[PDB]
Amino acid sequence: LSTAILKQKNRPNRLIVDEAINEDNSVVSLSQPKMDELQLFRGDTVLLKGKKRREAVCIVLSDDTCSDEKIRMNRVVRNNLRVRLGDVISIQPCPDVKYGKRIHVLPIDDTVEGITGNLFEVYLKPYFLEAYRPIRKGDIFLVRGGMRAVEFKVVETDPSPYCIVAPDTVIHCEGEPIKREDEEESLNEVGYDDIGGCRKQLAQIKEMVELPLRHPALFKEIGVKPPRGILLYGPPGTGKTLIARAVANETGAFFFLINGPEIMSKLAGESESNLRKAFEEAEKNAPAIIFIDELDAIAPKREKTHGEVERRIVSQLLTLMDGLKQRAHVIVMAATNRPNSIDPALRRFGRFDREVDIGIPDATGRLEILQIHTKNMKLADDVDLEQVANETHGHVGADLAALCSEAALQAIRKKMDLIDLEDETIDAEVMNSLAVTMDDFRWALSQSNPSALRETVVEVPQVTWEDIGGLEDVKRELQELVQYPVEHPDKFLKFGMTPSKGVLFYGPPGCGKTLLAKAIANECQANFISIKGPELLTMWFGESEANVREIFDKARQAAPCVLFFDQLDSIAKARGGNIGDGGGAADRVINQILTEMDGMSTKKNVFIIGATNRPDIIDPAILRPGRLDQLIYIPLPDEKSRVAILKANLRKSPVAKDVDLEFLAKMTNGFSGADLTEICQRACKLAIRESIESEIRRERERQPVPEIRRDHFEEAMRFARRSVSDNDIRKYEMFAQTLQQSRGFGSFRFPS
Amino acid sequence: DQLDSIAKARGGNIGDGGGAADRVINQILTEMDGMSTKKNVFIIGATNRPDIIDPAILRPGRLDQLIYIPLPDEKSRVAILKANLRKSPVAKDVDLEFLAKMTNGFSGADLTEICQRACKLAIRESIESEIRRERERQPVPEIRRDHFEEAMRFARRSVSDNDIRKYEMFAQTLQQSRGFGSFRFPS
Lengths: 752, 187
Ligand SMILES: Nc1ncnc2c1ncn2[C@@H]1O[C@H](COP(=O)(O)OP(=O)(O)OP(=O)(O)O)[C@@H](O)[C@H]1O
Ligand SMILES: Nc1ncnc2c1ncn2[C@@H]1O[C@H](COP(=O)(O)OP(=O)(O)O)[C@@H](O)[C@H]1O
Ligand SMILES: [Mg+2]
Fold this sequence. Notes:
This is part of a larger assembly, with two copies of chain A. Helix content of chain A is 39%, strand content 16%. Chain A is of the alpha/beta class. In chain A, helix 9 runs parallel beside helix 11. It is classed as translocase.
């Protein structure tokens, strides 16, 4: 019942907006049973209320084709109401409307440029002649006529705001021309419906701000003071400032904007006086809303601040919020990236009473954000927004906006070829043909990366599941590790068990441990963070452990995310190794990771994968189920596997049919995966050597090798050698034996 | 959560960082039990390896109770399996009592792994089954016994017998110096 406030409810006044048939800018049509329900007569003047606090007046008529639940209204009033077809409006009778005494109108520049004749005679008088048009202060209405229609705005009325344009009502159009920029900016103002995925957060913010202002009698009856401070926190791009703008636009209360840095002043006492002036102005126009952005910069902790100016600024803000003189009807909103950096005294009651967490949207939230951002763009029928929403695993609202913008830019880049790119004008046909398609969104998805993880980005060599030869059972567990919890979450809820998200790769060098991680980076539908082992460690005392939390929090923020620790033995050690180990910092890095993988915090869809050459030196606590659940042995490839490895390496290469890969696999009894790749790499170099030597001969006489041949492999083999010795293998075969001999050595079967 | 990190033996590493690690132990020492009056603040810590713990931290008045949480016996292994599956629909025919007897050195985390792996095998069949239905059109209500059977063959005990003995050795030293074993007042 937290979002019981959002439910628009079923009301007679709420009318679905639909197109009009014969109505002009001052009349609307309704169904006769609806007038019988609302007790309206044909010809009554009415109030129509739109989003972002817009209002209109028209004349209500009867339409026999009108659905009872819909209202007919033309494009002019729809733009006046900031309402599109399918939305809802509120309708109520408009009494006591008097004939206008004087109305002031002004044209729109983009509709009037090139029109030099008398605007009044050509446009206004025929439009208003004997019509008695009801208009409001601020209406935007279109008048046809002459060479081009000229758009008009009402700026002043007598009386205000509602009048009937009678024949005697003097109409004048002299004044300063209106700028197109103001009209377009008003159109593109942000509303509540612009927010996406913050339904719970929007519920909370609405309860704090909108409800007390609209219905003070309720809080007076229950006899409590509603919360007067809201703190919005979360990762960047979640919509904190956007929610601020939406609240500012959709409230009939004074809004003041404060930016943490811009309040500062070198001269002593002027920043405190700036804060005092802002709060004095807000109290002057009470009720008022104050938004302080980047509150961390203005208001850090007083205890850990050496600057006197910063401490006194925090104290001044603290006193303004909850001093002796309680602020009457001022709601202070604040937004910050790091709520912990804020002075704890500010996070009290009476000062930012209810902190609101703007989080990363889920699959449904990102679909809503995509629909919001793509409404202004033209989409082909093939475009699927559900698929794109499902693909953007770690994306935040700003990331989704960047994705939409990148798809739009790619559409123009596709239309690049036709135009010369330097013509004075572009031909109208190619402009009309330009439209975004699904392939543009797919390209943007390939290019787009979450803003949170722009640091942990590495270019990967584009390895696909086919490029890995053998390891079929190792592969199958690897799709199922990531796909099952993300693609079928409901199944785990059904059977009631959490997924197992830990995997460790151990084996002899060069057998495919790193290559599998490259495959996961591309094929798996989840964010990928690649971590080298010693990259976390830092010479400072607390930095090495802090970097561990930063990496794990990035994965939690952008879940589902695969956290791959290459050479995990560098990070993870048996603990208690040497007296001098950088002061025990490596021993202390272990204890920080053990809490991140499995600690007193809720589990997220973070998949920790680690590859190590020597796995016996790993801390036993790391190998525990719940941290690294599965221990997969990546052994030296067998003759069946070696057959596939040769195919995978030479698939792109043109190789003669005379060569058989089966004989290659049979001869190499103990070669690793890298050894077989070096054999194929050596074959090209000899083929390269022969090919260039041939062309130089052919060029010399003036002044061949289409495919890799059998004698190249025979020549390349004699340089090849086995990378991993038997004594190295026995170490790895020994560790797997301990795991098998521990349990599962005897097949386990239930009794009949 | 990991008390051996913040509270380690002093003097083990000479020149450890700036010496800050040893001074933090001193700060914890005074805060837990010092000249100030003690409120109702209960300090609870967990550590994998308690041998590196500073003996001062272990002194009564600071973590006075040293609770040893050993590997579950057979009776606990039944409870651990039931506790994991209390919200999980399982077949009646599967007997959790047998599973406890087969596993001997399995941890509570290891037992959950068998149950979790059993769930993933069932989910694999359910996905494949619903794929087959789509092919013919154009399943697994509860966890079955064969799902646990295939899960167990991948299972393995995480704590080695050597890793156990480092804990019995620490536990025994407490009991070795605990006194004359059982204690009865004269008469
Ligand atoms: N199964 C395989 N299929 C295809 N290529 C393979 C396979 N195994 C190894 N390779 C080749 O081995 C090389 C590197 O292997 P990879 O990086 O996966 O090994 P690693 O054992 O994880 O690494 P390292 O031991 O060198 O730290 C690449 O040339 C890759 O093509
Ligand atoms: N929930 C959302 N719905 C619609 N658009 C969003 C949402 N969240 C973010 N955006 C888009 O991303 C941008 C977010 O930037 P903003 O939230 O102002 O940054 P910050 O959170 O650091 O103040 C906005 O310009 C908006 O267009
Ligand atoms: Mg490697």
